[PDB]
Design a protein around this motif. Sequence first.
Motif, short mmCIF file in Angstrom:
data_model
loop_
_atom_site.label_atom_id
_atom_site.label_comp_id
_atom_site.label_asym_id
_atom_site.label_seq_id
_atom_site.Cartn_x
_atom_site.Cartn_y
_atom_site.Cartn_z
N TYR A 298 1.05 81.39 39.75
CA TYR A 298 2.29 80.79 39.28
C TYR A 298 3.12 80.26 40.44
O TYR A 298 3.90 79.31 40.26
N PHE A 299 2.98 80.84 41.62
CA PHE A 299 3.70 80.42 42.82
C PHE A 299 2.73 79.86 43.85
O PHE A 299 2.89 80.08 45.05
N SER A 300 0.45 84.18 50.91
CA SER A 300 1.81 84.40 50.44
C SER A 300 2.32 85.76 50.89
O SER A 300 1.53 86.65 51.22
N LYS A 301 3.64 85.92 50.92
CA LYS A 301 4.22 87.22 51.23
C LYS A 301 4.05 88.22 50.08
O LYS A 301 4.12 89.43 50.31
N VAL A 302 3.84 87.73 48.86
CA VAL A 302 3.50 88.60 47.74
C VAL A 302 2.09 89.16 47.93
O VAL A 302 1.80 90.28 47.49
#
Lengths: 326, 331, 328, 116, 336, 209, 105
Positions: A298-299, A300-302
Amino acid sequence: ITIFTRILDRLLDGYDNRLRPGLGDAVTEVKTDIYVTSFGPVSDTDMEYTIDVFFRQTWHDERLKFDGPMKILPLNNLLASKIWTPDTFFHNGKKSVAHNMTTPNKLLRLVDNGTLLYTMRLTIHAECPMHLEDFPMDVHACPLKFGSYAYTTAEVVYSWTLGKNKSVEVAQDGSRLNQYDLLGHVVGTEIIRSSTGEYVVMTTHFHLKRKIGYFVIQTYLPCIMTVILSQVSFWLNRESVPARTVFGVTTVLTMTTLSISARNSLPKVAYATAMDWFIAVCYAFVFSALIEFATVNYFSKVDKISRIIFPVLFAIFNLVYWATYV
Amino acid sequence: SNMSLVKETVDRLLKGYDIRLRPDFGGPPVAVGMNIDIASIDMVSEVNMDYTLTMYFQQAWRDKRLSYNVIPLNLTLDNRVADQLWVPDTYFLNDKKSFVHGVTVKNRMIRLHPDGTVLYGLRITTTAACMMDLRRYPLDEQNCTLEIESYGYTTDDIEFYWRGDDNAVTGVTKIELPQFSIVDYKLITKKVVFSTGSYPRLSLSFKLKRNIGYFILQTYMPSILITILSWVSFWINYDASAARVALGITTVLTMTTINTHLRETLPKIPYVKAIDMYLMGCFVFVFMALLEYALVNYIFFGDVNAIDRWSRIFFPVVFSFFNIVYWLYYV
Amino acid sequence: SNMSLVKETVDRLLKGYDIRLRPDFGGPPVAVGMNIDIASIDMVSEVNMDYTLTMYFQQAWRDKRLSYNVIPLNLTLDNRVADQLWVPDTYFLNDKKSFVHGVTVKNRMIRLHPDGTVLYGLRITTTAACMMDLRRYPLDEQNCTLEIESYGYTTDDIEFYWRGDDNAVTGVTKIELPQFSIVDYKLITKKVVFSTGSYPRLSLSFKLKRNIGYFILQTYMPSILITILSWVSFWINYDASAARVALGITTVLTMTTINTHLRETLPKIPYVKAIDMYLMGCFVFVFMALLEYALVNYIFFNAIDRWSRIFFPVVFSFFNIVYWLYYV
Amino acid sequence: VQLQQSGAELVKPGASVKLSCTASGFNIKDTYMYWVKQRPEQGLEWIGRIDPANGDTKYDPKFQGKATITTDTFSNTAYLQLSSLTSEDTAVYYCARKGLRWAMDYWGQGTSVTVS
Amino acid sequence: DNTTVFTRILDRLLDGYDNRLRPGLGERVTEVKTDIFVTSFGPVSDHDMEYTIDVFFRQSWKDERLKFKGPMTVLRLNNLMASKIWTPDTFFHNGKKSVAHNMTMPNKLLRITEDGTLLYTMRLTVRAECPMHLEDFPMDAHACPLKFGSYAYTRAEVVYEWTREPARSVVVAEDGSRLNQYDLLGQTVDSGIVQSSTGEYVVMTTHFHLKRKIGYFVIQTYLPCIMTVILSQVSFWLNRESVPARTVFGVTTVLTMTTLSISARNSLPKVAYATAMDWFIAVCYAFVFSALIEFATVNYFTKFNSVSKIDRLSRIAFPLLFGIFNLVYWATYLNR
Amino acid sequence: EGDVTVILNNLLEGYDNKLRPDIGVKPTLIHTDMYVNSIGPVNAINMEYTIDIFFAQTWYDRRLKFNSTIKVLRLNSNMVGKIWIPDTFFRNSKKADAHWITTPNRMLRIWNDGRVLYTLRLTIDAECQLQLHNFPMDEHSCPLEFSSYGYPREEIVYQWKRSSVEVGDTRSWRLYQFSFVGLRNTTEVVKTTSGDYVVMSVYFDLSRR
Amino acid sequence: NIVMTQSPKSMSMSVGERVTLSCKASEYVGTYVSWYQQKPEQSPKLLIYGASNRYTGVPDRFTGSGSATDFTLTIGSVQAEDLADYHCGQSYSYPTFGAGTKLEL
Ligand SMILES: CCCCCCCC/C=C/CCCCCCCC(=O)O[C@@H](COC(=O)CCCCCCCCCCCCCCC)COP(=O)([O-])OCC[N+](C)(C)C
Ligand SMILES: CCCCCCCC/C=C/CCCCCCCC(=O)O[C@@H](COC(=O)CCCCCCCCCCCCCCC)COP(=O)([O-])OCC[N+](C)(C)C
Ligand SMILES: CCCCCCCC(=O)OC[C@H](COP(=O)(O)O[C@@H]1[C@H](O)[C@H](O)[C@@H](OP(=O)(O)O)[C@H](OP(=O)(O)O)[C@H]1O)OC(=O)CCCCCCC
Ligand SMILES: CCCCCCCC(=O)OC[C@H](COP(=O)(O)O[C@@H]1[C@H](O)[C@H](O)[C@@H](OP(=O)(O)O)[C@H](OP(=O)(O)O)[C@H]1O)OC(=O)CCCCCCC
Ligand SMILES: *[C@@H]1O[C@H](CO)[C@@H](O[C@@H]2O[C@H](CO)[C@@H](O[C@@H]3O[C@H](CO)[C@@H](O)[C@H](O)[C@@H]3O)[C@H](O)[C@H]2NC(C)=O)[C@H](O)[C@H]1NC(C)=O
Ligand SMILES: *[C@@H]1O[C@H](CO)[C@@H](O[C@@H]2O[C@H](CO)[C@@H](O)[C@H](O)[C@H]2NC(C)=O)[C@H](O)[C@H]1NC(C)=O
Ligand SMILES: *[C@@H]1O[C@H](CO)[C@@H](O)[C@H](O)[C@H]1NC(C)=O
Ligand SMILES: *[C@@H]1O[C@H](CO)[C@@H](O)[C@H](O)[C@H]1NC(C)=O
């Protein structure tokens, strides 16, 4: 040999196998031994266990008083069906067999003072109430209840022959257990109250403990790998959408087919054992790897924070789960 | 006639016969010579932990009551006279289920020797129990026994012996289990003691060696060749991610599946077998190979060709060394 | 009084009763009338090729040695006189394993009537063999029998007939088969001839007709939907490869799983069944669709696939018309 | 344990001849009676087979119709007939009982018929 | 009564009748005439290497003590008398579990004729063992035997014989065939002497020639593995840039061959040797593995690009080689 | 011996076990009673369930009349085959087995007026119809019917005792899916091809969890 | 039915050496053959039944061999009183015969 022919005939000339010894006089005491030759396998699905015993009985009969050249008469089984024997049945047995090769397997010795020794070889599928709440770390106390059927407490009471510990002796080599190991046995004598009278019931509980060795290598350690197979996908590319895809579409189905496989080979009870709880939390661990992938798609730091928090969050749960049971 | 002469001889023999009393009741024990002709070993189930054995169990003892000094013939009477004569109380101690075949009549015989010798054979199929050490499975060598014992008569009343020593067991060479292979058999006469006396004991044992060709066809070679499949990912370029991912995680899935599929064909033993050790390791390779690809992807997207050309052959050999260690340990 | 009379009577009858010789041993054949009350037909089997049948078997003949006149009632004797009276030697030819239920006694019945009629009823659970031609499987219909014959007595020592003639067998209508449906039942009397003589024979036969309702929702309709899912690849653009290749291969593997998933629970019959032929046709259509995509990527390296959105649903629907007109 | 037959026969071709053999010392019902044809300086050829207990006779597929075999009960004897005998029917005949393992144990003494 | 004659005849027969002794004990040998009527040749269990047979096993011996002069010649009776008289102890040498049926009464026939001939048949379900060699499975043919002889009485005591001609002394019934895998080709009997520990015994043998059918096996193992080689052969016609697609081809077809290899070895003895089906599975797996190695080779050489020489040569080489192997195999075994 | 032996030999002096007591006098009224030990696993696939009982019967055979100091005649299973036992069978029992180890599990008490209590231990795989509608949230009532086999309604009649159906601990039972909600008893007349029979039914109400 | 092709038709050796007969079956006859000798002016006499079974009154020199199809008869050290024809029979089906074999000095 003709002397012992007439001795055995004078003992049977007037004997009545329908009557217990001392019917209107006193109580017929029966001394009982159990020699477990081979504690057989335990079926969880049927909640029954198999046991091979040498069921010995001992009682006093004054009608078989003989005085001759012998002190003990080890006769065959064809003098047992025409002498009064106790009516001992197993209260929690389902279907149990008396062997018959090459003769029927019973022993009968008549001691000079009228004492009888009656040893008969059995194989018992007795019931065992099993609580499957601590599966597979669970411990059980499978009993073997035996008592009289048609004779109440006023005429027949059983007793243990030797001491309370030296009566349910287990053979050391003979043990057909492939899942459990025999810890010990405890002995108890009770009084039961049925609708027809008072009967004596003796219990022999065999303490059992389930070895975790089968289930740590069949169901547990695959259920670990699965989710650390599920720890590869955080280490992959953010753009690599069809890869982590196959990575995840498979981990869930392997959690499902091991949920059914762990639910195989155990009673279809309505309560949850302490096997599905390890699976379902690990299934929620596998499913959470899908949600982060749906988040990063849907959008890394995650992605980086899921590489650190989540392997330790599973490494907290195993330190909790493998400390309160084991 | 000879018919009525044999009739009055048998009528004289079985009149006043006490079946409840063994021969020589107040005297010595009776020597019972016992020889076995194995008809065929039906099968050996590791799941039920037993084996099935058809035999021609024969017992020879001497009764002084059954002595006739007129007719010089071995009186082979019908099988219905066996229930009118004393027979020994012989029982097998580790049988789980056994029966005497009864078609078209009961399969047993009574050969009366004029001196007093009685020969009493039976055709018996015993599902005798046999505990197994399934640690070296399937490259194991089990040892299954058949314990023969008297039940009610002690060593003061019946003594047992094989008739003709090692020539008492015949026909075991022609037997042909479909998976094992009889290497050797031995005959032991021991004297076990229980709480009611010491009893005679004859034990006939077999040493069965398992053939691995069925396991080579079923569980070894698919594991080896899924393993040889998993190294073509080392030849595939790194940027084609889906192919490498599919290769690694599929090999892995099959490795488990197969390990799940074959473990239910064996009982719930808590230890580890040789085949479990191989598949446990085989998983490692497919798991590792997959982690090697993951490390290559992390190195590129975080020399990939140098480490690829290394593990492009490292696994093949490390795997050959592990194969050589596993086979030289167990063969 | 009465129990005083009944005794001397049932003591006279059996006194001098020689079970060896049959009624009219040297006279006409024994007329034996047979009644069957079906209690339950349960496991119709195709792996073992047999059906389980529970019934109240009942026989009726006349013995003049068992005649009473003083008592006007009916000597309902206990079940243990049957070893002392003569009964016929009725057996079942296609039997495999049968028994009389033994709780709380042996389930049998003898009722001596005042002329000499012997009523002999027994509770039998039988497993009679029934060979099945599962070629139209599952849209088949099987004819499972039960051959009632005398063994040792010839057509000059026993004659068999149905007491009810056509109603001699009741309770068939109240038999609900887990996965079949009993349509017709017939009663046939005839004589069979062996080398030792000629013997009378009754036969009770049922016409089972299977219900394809369960079968149509897990063997036919999953196979239809997978073949529908195979044609989704025609609308996907040739520009892409992996989606069409993965869809076609998962279609192939699901078809192979569903055809080598059913024949395990069936006898290893060497012939081809109707469901097997239908799944073969579905596999042929799926394989032809996958050989279509090879064709496309190969012919390029928009009209070949355009013909396939029209042609493939036409022939498959044309295949369903031919299949459901034959096996119906 | 002896098989006794009749004498020789002198008959014209196209006629019918009656020939028989009698077994003594044993009953013929338990055993099988056979018949064989020995034309001179050739091999043996089997004629047919009966059994007195049942009575279902059965013959060689090249000897039915023209040859039948019958028997009775009381006289312990097996008879036969020939119909329309020809030049090749000049031979010598034996009857043989069934022995152990169906061996044709005890044979006849020989009845040679000649045509003219 | 008129029946009293027929019970004064039987009580005259069984008066002083010692049933423990064979007829003609110290005088002769008990010739027992035997025949078998196979009402239904049951299914053959391949995994247990045995077969099931329903019979009307007949016997016919001669007893001189059972001689009577009555109004009737044949004296057809019930089984009770069969337990009161001497019957032979015929057991089955290679039998494993035989059921002497008894529904609804005991299924036995006893016929004493006037002279003293007996006939005593019974309905049995012999589950005899059949040693099977499966090197040409599933195009194999077995001769499953059926051996029966006396247990206690030697060759000088009880001998056996066939009552009819040996070609017609085992009669298989016309409608009796519960065989699904095999078909009963024919009959074969023999009579011999066996040597054992107690003496020599006359043994009777009945060989049943069974030829296995491959129709099911064609559906289950051959044609799935023929299509799987063709399925991986589709990958030769794709691009050289379809690397994920052709890995899906290689992986799925090798997995299909692997699960058909495992699923082929079921309901079967765990034999050490490799059957004729295994040498088809191995070559099919070699073909699909060679297809995957061919894809790996053409992927290593893949860098517009041009059609591969390896692919163009494989498109001709693989189907001809598979056809030659199929022709050689299906002539090696099928047309053996 | 001396007293009880001559009592028993005075009882079966020609006693026919073939003629029910009072064969032409009156219908033999049988008082039944049941103590359920454990209801086993409800096999839903075979539509059957397993039940373990102590099947009690109490008829009034008059020939078993004795006048002595001893009031009740507690006996073993040896006497059971010597006297008239009713031929009660279970009409929906797919299969059943009495227990024999180490002795036949039967009881026989003869009072001085003539009551003959007779209990035995049985394990019955009784057939239960199971409707598959509303699966899995469905309730059931599995029956257990029993009647005579040969003796009709004019010859022996069955009867229930107010508290005849007896249930035990309800915790060691093998009812994994189902739970024992309640019980009920019904007594009707069946019409078969041999006559009228009195059928006693015990319904066991089960609800799935 | 069953065709027997026993060979040879005539063969001659001297007195006191081994002679081997042969008989071939067209179909399966399983150890049910029978060997007969034909003395001049004499009926056939049973010599060997089964496949290899010496009949009573037969000397030890007469030895036969058996199989499913091919059968041989061997005489060790033949002499003058054995100078006779020899026939091969069968009984697995309806009985047939061979041609015969002459012996000469
Ligand atoms: C699909 C293929 C995969 C292959 C993989 C291969 C590599 C991996 C394999 C590694 C090891 C596998 C082999 C050993 C298994 C058997 C052990 C055993 O029997 O010992 C004991 C049972 O076992 C235990 O007690 C286990 C204890 C808990 C372990 C839980 C997993 C690790 C914890 C962290 C998990 C998460 C960590 C990471 C978190 C991110 C025996 O106990 P017992 O019965 O009482 O003893 C005998 C009793 N007696 C004396 C009376 C006889
Ligand atoms: C998984 C889905 C796949 C679907 C596929 C698509 C649908 C395909 C259609 C399928 C329907 C047709 C088959 C149905 C089965 C019945 C027929 C049968 O097997 O007969 C017999 C086989 O007889 C033989 O001779 C064997 C022939 C094997 C041929 C193998 C394929 C060609 C070989 C080259 C392959 C490579 C070629 C290409 C190379 C590049 C079986 O015999 P029986 O009956 O047991 O007994 C004998 C007969 N009797 C009774 C008369 C004596
Ligand atoms: C299970 C997880 C649920 C998370 C729910 C909540 C998830 C949530 O709210 O995410 C928003 C954001 C996503 O960041 P992410 O790295 O995915 O997205 C990048 C980010 O927005 C950069 O700022 C962009 O650079 P730029 O400046 O545009 O140039 C870059 O674009 P470009 O560089 O390609 O142009 C983007 O790709 O994450 C956080 O703010 C911290 C997450 C903390 C997560 C929690 C910490 C405790
Ligand atoms: C399992 C089989 C393994 C076989 C291993 C065989 C290994 C082997 O020897 O490969 C060499 C060659 C590779 O041919 P292929 O076409 O795959 O490779 C071309 C080759 O490398 C050219 O040299 C390249 O041109 P260039 O000069 O760079 O410009 C061309 O690229 P471009 O033109 O697009 O630029 C490449 O595509 O194959 C054969 O000759 C057929 C052998 C068939 C052998 C039999 C096959 C069954
Ligand atoms: C199920 O299969 C059985 C067996 O094939 C079928 O029984 C057959 O039914 C017909 C019609 O009733 C019988 O033919 C009749 O035979 C009598 C003589 O017995 C004759 O008088 C009639 O005119 C007629 O031809 C036939 O004999 C019988 N089968 C056998 C082998 O006896 C049955 O009909 C099938 N269907 C059902 C619903 O049972
Ligand atoms: C007892 O025997 C009598 C003999 O007459 C049976 O009488 C039956 O009477 C009914 C009513 O008229 C008829 O329907 C039956 O057909 C008669 N049975 C015959 C003639 O056999 C009576 O049914 C018998 N009852 C019992 C309990 O056995
Ligand atoms: C009797 O049996 C013995 C033991 O085998 C044997 O030596 C002897 O020869 C036999 N006697 C006869 C006459 O069979
Ligand atoms: C059923 O049980 C009740 C008590 O629960 C009892 O009163 C009744 O009589 C029994 N049977 C019937 C309906 O008669």
